[PDB]
């Protein structure tokens, strides 16, 4: 089914296949009505235009609410397998089989075009009811098939005789390809083919004289191979329109990003383009660009990325230079270059001002904090602080925003969570973001919906309620990840959770080998801290504490200056408490623990107070004053069982007191 691929502005052999089916359905002489599902799979890919930006937008509208079958490749083998599935589909498939055998010439092709335009197609419904004398079904221009057939008819009167000669040469080439297939052998004889074929071949006006040499003109042109064939220019094996090719690739990249498809067939045909279709169809370059990221190729990806932005910018009359730089900046952020992306992005702001268009700045401003969210350590380098943006976007407008406010409030929530603000304000801010996301469609905006789940699981896990976290955890999508943050980030993140499980299960050999991978991999900041935190916990288990104690405080010191992450400042703090008291010297931690107790009492996070409570009771039991620790734990025993992951530490202390 493979062959050279070429873009054609004329009647592809695929287009006539739909034309064959619509003729049978409208003729109503055979009583054969094509199922509505068959038409919706064939014509719909041909419908014009879907559009797809490289990045900055993921499946904003491309996602179909109802799952759709993949578009069908232009091979007679693939089209039949659609009709063939039905028990009576052999009747429908044979109808197409007979017609494709009936059309042995270009004049016959013209017969089909003339029949549809004069009788079948109808200008408007007002003449439909006055055409009750028609023995065939009639179609309106504005209908689904009507607008399709009008374009096909327009696409037929547009070319010269050179256009029609190429029509018939390829179809016979297209037809004879299916002849050398196993499926054709199963349909070698079907008696119904002769019946349907003879229905249209009648009224030939000659059967004695012209048909002897009518055969001669075709056979001589065809490759009988008795002698050397008549020499002709190389002809493409498959012809596809721009719109049909757009639907296959868009489905392929979406399917690759996250009824069976043919990845092998689509990729081979797309590799045989004549280098002029790629200019008329720039999206072929990016199809390599997504593939290039998969194997993590640096030089290959950049040439494809640059190539896609040279062809797209000129075709679109609007200025798109202000979009190319940030996307390249996005690509730079994907390979953890970070600093190189900053210089590239900076020049994007200057070009946007020259255009003097307001709508693009919001796209620029949204990209700002998305990059800072992945890499919070660069918040100082920007010319605008993160708090400035939130104040601008909150009062941005009252109309024509839709998703801007949904974006605006989530960034405030991350900063408030990092700033260890009061839990009353964090819940209210998160409420603002949850209400605006779910108000509109959450399915189309898959990216923010996943980010809601990630925050809410993180927010409630921080509160200490795993029961709530578990419900939302089943909705967080895996391996989906997000744009501008690598491509193997999902694999690494899944690996971190395995390592944490291995520490609990005392698989010290596994974690030790993984820590070797940590020091020479390029990791996102959120991934850095976890492995940075993982290294601290592993060293505590081993028993060596001089290195870990000198190591943990440098982390927290740079966890307060480089990034003002309070949550990770707290989480790092308690291991040092655990390191001290495990070494039979926890009194040094008494000044440190109390500063956090009254500090977190004002905040009101119950998980924070109780964890400090366990460390306080544990301090008091290693000094020789376990009497009052029992009294203190007894009054608060009711409120400390509400948190599941501390019960194991809580229950274990109970047998010690006994």
């Amino acid at each position: 089914k493979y062959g050279p691929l070429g873009i054609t502005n004329f009647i592809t052999p695929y287009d006539l296949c739909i034309l064959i089916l619509i003729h049978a359905h409208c003729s109503q002489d055979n009583g054969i009505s094509v199922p509505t599902a068959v038409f919706l799979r064939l014509i719909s890919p041909t419908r014009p235009s879907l559009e797809w930006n490289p990045l900055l937008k993921d499946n904003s509208n491309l996602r179909s609410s109802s799952i759709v079958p993949p578009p069908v490749l232009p091979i007679l083998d693939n089209i039949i397998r659609i009709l063939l599935d039905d028990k009576d589909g052999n009747k429908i498939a044979l109808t197409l089989m007979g017609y494709l055998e009936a059309i042995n010439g270009l004049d016959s092709i013209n017969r089909l075009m003339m029949d549809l335009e004069k009788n079948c197609l109808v200008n408007n419904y007002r003449s439909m009811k006055m055409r009750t004398t028609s023995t065939r079904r009639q179609m309106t221009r504005a209908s689904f098939l009507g607008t399709f057939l009008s374009t096909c008819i327009r696409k037929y009167q547009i070319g010269d005789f050179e256009m029609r000669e190429t029509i018939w040469i390829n179809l016979q080439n297209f037809k004879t390809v299916f002849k050398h297939t196993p499926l054709w052998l199963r349909f070698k004889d079907n008696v119904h083919i002769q019946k349907v074929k003879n229905c249209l071949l009648a009224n030939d006006e000659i059967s004695v004289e012209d048909q002897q040499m009518v055969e001669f003109f075709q056979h001589f042109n065809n490759g009988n191979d008795a002698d050397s064939k008549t020499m002709n220019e190389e002809n493409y094996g498959t012809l596809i329109s721009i719109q049909h090719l757009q639907s296959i690739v868009n489905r392929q990249i979406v399917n690759w990003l996250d009824y069976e498809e043919q990845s092998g067939l689509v990729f081979d045909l797309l590799d045989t383009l004549s280098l002029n279709d790629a200019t008329k169809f720039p999206l072929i370059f990016i199809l390599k660009y997504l593939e290039a990221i998969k194997e993590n190729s640096y030089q290959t990806a950049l040439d494809s990325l640059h190539n896609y932005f040279d062809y797209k910018s000129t075709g679109n009359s609007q200025n798109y230079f202000h979009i190319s730089l940030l996307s390249l900046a996005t690509f730079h952020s994907s390979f953890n270059e970070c600093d190189a992306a900053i210089n590239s992005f900076e020049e994007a702001t200057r070009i946007a001002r020259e255009n003097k268009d307001m709508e693009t700045l919001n796209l620029i401003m949204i990209w700002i904090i998305n990059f800072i969210e992945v890499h919070p350590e660069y918040a100082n380098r920007f010319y605008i602080t993160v708090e400035q943006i939130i104040k601008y976007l909150k009062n941005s407008s009252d109309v024509e925003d839709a998703n801007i406010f949904s974006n605006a409030y989530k960034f405030e929530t991350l900063l408030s969570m990092v700033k260890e603000s009061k839990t009353a304000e964090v819940s209210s801010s998160l409420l603002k973001f949850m209400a605006i996301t779910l108000q509109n469609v959450p399915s189309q905006n898959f990216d923010l919906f996943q980010s809601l789940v990630s925050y809410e699981v993180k927010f409630w896990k921080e509160l200490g309620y795993e029961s709530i976290s578990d419900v939302y955890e089943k909705f967080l999508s895996k391996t989906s990840s997000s744009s501008l943050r690598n491509y193997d980030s999902s694999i690494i993140n899944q690996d971190i959770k395995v390592a944490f499980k291995a520490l609990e299960e005392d698989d010290f050999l596994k974690v030790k080998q993984y820590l070797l991978k940590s020091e020479s991999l390029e990791l996102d900041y959120d991934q850095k801290i976890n492995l940075k935190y993982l290294r601290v916990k592993y060293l505590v288990k081993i028993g060596d504490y001089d290195l870990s104690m000198r190591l943990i405080n440098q982390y927290v010191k740079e966890c307060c200056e480089e990034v003002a992450d309070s949550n990770w400042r707290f989480k790092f703090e308690i291991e040092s408490i655990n390191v001290l008291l495990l070494s039979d010297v926890g009194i040094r931690s008494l000044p440190k623990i109390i500063k956090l107790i009254d500090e977190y009492k004002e905040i009101g996070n119950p998980l924070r107070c109780v964890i400090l409570l366990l460390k306080l009771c544990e301090v008091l039991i290693q000094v020789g004053k376990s009497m009052e620790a029992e009294c203190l734990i007894s009054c608060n025993l009711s409120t400390i069982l509400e948190f599941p992951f501390v019960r194991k530490k809580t229950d274990e202390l109970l047998e010690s007191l006994s």
């Binding site: 194997e295 190729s297 640096y298 030089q299 009062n395 406010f405 005392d506 010290f508 991978k517 104690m549």
Partner: protein, 663 residues
């Protein structure tokens, strides 16, 4: 299929990374272990892959094509590309640059140039430089900065030229001078330049100031090592360089002291062990290969008899590199370093060999009892020294059967036959370990293993019959021992103190029995030295609390170093600092050992002004009704669509109604 490359980068010790080449010279993958990092594809043939530095302190991976070089910044920055005057045969890395060899001949006529075929470049943008040679393909070059020997072999002559290359920076960049020469064996016949170079193998080894070069040829089983000692006086001599005269004593060529030197499969350098140790692979059958260890400088060799059949391939080198064990924890490293600093290199290298053997036997014996951790290496450490000190039991004894595998090894026999080393070195090891235990006693975060040492050291004393004072120093209540009294920091510190009933006593540290500068002692026991100096300065009769900040600053003591002390030493100094928390208000430098932010911030402001750097603004932690759901959404949708100065004015002027009246 992918092929691994042996040496890629000069990183004065090694780098964690791998390079994969495709079946043809068209792809380079910087995979770490199994994750495909930056991948580069090229139409031309790829010669080599880099990651070297370029004298500007970069961390860049460089790939050289036939006539074009790509320099991709990995640590920071983008990518660069440079051209070359002519075609390049091969490229060899050296410290801060690359050496490029011209393509000699291609077709089949064979013609080549000899006047100048080598190019030196430091960084991509700067122009190239020319080599300098004074009284010929470069087979190998000293890529590592530490080693300084280059080997040259000229084809027809079949002789080697050993030089002493020294790097010249800010055109002649490198200079070479001949020292000696070696004649290849007649049986060695070399016939595609890389394929000719492929058969011959060379390695770079270094210990202290001695260097050895390993020349190996598998088809003819030819193996020799050329050694030189880098004497600072001889090398710096002007006649030595230009004239090339070299004393004959320094130059020496010798073979390996192995059982079957003619049956060696292949050898590699131990990446994990920085010293002279070299991997040796030997085979006795087509399905079994025995691996052993040998040291070039000291004739000590390690009997290991490790069997590995499928690991002999090149692409499987890292696993083989991970085959032999080294202590990967943080405790026995200092013990091994102390042994190294107090024992001869031969005893040292034999000790790692015996410890590795003992480590392997215990891993085989221990069937994953509970976890396996620091106790593993400590048991290896303790049992190796015990066997060294305990007389060998009779063959019928049960203890003989359990540790038979260590007894028959040649090194353990030799390490027990040598009467001199057992006579004097072992007390030194015990004293060094006792000082290590004492050093741990000052770090409270590590009492556990502290106590551990105690047990073994007790055994050591029980083995040696030292005076009961040493043995009783551990209870709550035939070599010659040099020290009659155990040296203790705490005893000496109480000695250097006011109102000290005990008389004056010195700590008699090991800086004199190590015969090495105090710099080496500093990196092993910093806490002991820090505390000794600090209480040497504080208890002076002319001491004031003001200078304590300068002493702490000069002694590199930080907040963490202060919070880790087993009471005692800790108690006065906080209070001393506490005293400084009251009367100190004049900004007298080095405020960071304090915990007051205002003084350190003003000092940072002043230092910026004096220099003419982080003006970290303090975020106002502002803090009440919670209201309802509907009100919050209405408020945000509503907001969707001088005051402080006036407040200051109400505070700038007060106590009267003059301002309102005048307005």
């Amino acid at each position: 299929e992918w092929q691994l490359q042996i040496n890629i980068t000069n990183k004065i010790g090694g780098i964690n990374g791998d390079i994969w080449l495709s079946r043809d010279g068209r792809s380079v993958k910087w995979c770490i272990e199994d994750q495909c990092l930056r991948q580069f594809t090229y139409n031309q043939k790829i010669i080599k892959a880099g990651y070297i530095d370029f004298e500007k302190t970069p961390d860049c991976f460089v790939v050289v094509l036939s006539d074009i070089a790509h320099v991709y910044m990995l640590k920071n920055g983008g990518s660069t590309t440079v051209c070359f005057p002519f075609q390049i045969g091969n490229a060899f890395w050296y410290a801060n640059g690359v050496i490029l060899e011209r393509e000699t001949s291609a077709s089949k006529p064979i013609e080549f140039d000899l006047k100048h075929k080598y190019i030196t470049l430091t960084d991509p943008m700067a122009p190239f430089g020319l080599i300098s040679i004074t009284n010929f393909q470069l087979v190998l070059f000293p890529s590592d900065k530490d080693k300084c020997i280059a080997v040259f072999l000229d084809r027809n002559s079949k002789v080697l030229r050993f030089y002493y290359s020294r790097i010249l920076s800010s055109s002649k960049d490198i200079v070479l001078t001949e020292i000696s020469s070696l004649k290849l064996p007649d049986d060695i016949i070399f016939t595609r330049l890389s394929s000719i170079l492929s058969k011959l193998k060379f390695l770079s080894l270094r210990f202290e100031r001695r260097e050895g070069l390993l020349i190996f040829h598998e088809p003819t089983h030819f193996c020799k090592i050329w050694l030189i000692d880098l004497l600072p006086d001889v090398l710096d001599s002007i006649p030595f360089k230009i004239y090339g005269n070299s004393p004959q004593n320094m130059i020496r060529l010798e073979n390996l002291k192995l059982k079957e030197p003619s049956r060696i499969q292949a050898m590699y350098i131990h990446e994990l062990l920085e010293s002279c140790l070299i991997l040796v692979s030997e085979g006795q059958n087509k399905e079994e290969y025995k691996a052993c260890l040998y040291d070039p400088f000291v004739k000590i060799t390690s009997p290991s008899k490790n069997i590995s059949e499928e690991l002999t391939k090149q692409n499987s080198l890292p696993s083989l590199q991970k085959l032999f064990p080294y202590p990967e924890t943080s405790f026995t490293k200092l013990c091994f370093e102390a042994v190294k600093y107090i024992t001869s290199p031969a005893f040292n290298i034999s000790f790692i060999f015996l410890w590795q053997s003992a480590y392997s036997i215990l891993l085989s014996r221990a069937n994953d009892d509970v976890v396996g951790g620091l106790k593993m290496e400590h048991d290896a450490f303790s049992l190796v020294l015990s066997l060294l000190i305990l007389p060998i039991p009779s063959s019928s004894a049960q203890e003989y059967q359990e540790y038979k595998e260590i007894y028959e090894r040649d090194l353990f026999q030799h390490l027990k036959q040598d009467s001199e080393i057992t006579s004097s070195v072992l007390p030194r090891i015990v004293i060094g370990l006792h000082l290590i235990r004492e050093e741990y006693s000052l770090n409270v975060l590590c009492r556990n293993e502290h106590a551990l040492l105690g047990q073994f050291l007790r055994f050591a004393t029980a083995a040696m019959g030292w005076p009961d004072l040493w043995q009783s120093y551990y209870v709550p209540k035939t070599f010659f021992h040099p020290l009659d009294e155990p040296p203790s920091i705490t005893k000496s510190l109480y000695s250097i103190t006011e109102n000290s009933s005990i008389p004056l006593c010195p700590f008699i540290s090991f800086s004199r029995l190590v015969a090495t500068d105090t710099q080496v002692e500093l990196r092993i026991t910093p806490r002991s030295f820090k505390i000794l100096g600090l209480y040497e300065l504080v208890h002076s009769p002319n001491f004031l609390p003001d200078y304590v900040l300068g002493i702490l600053s000069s002694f590199k003591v930080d907040k963490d170093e202060l919070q880790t002390y087993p009471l005692g030493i800790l108690v006065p100094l906080q209070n001393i600092l506490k005293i400084l928390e009251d009367k100190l208000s004049e900004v007298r430098d080095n405020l960071e050992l304090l915990d007051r932010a205002d003084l350190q911030r003003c000092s940072a402001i002043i230092n910026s002004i004096r220099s003419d750097c982080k003006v970290p603004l303090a975020k106002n932690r502002s803090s009440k009704k919670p209201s309802d759901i509907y009100s919050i959404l209405s408020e945000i949708v509503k907001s969707a669509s001088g005051r402080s100065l006036k407040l200051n004015a109400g505070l700038i002027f007060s106590e009267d109604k003059r301002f309102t009246h005048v307005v």
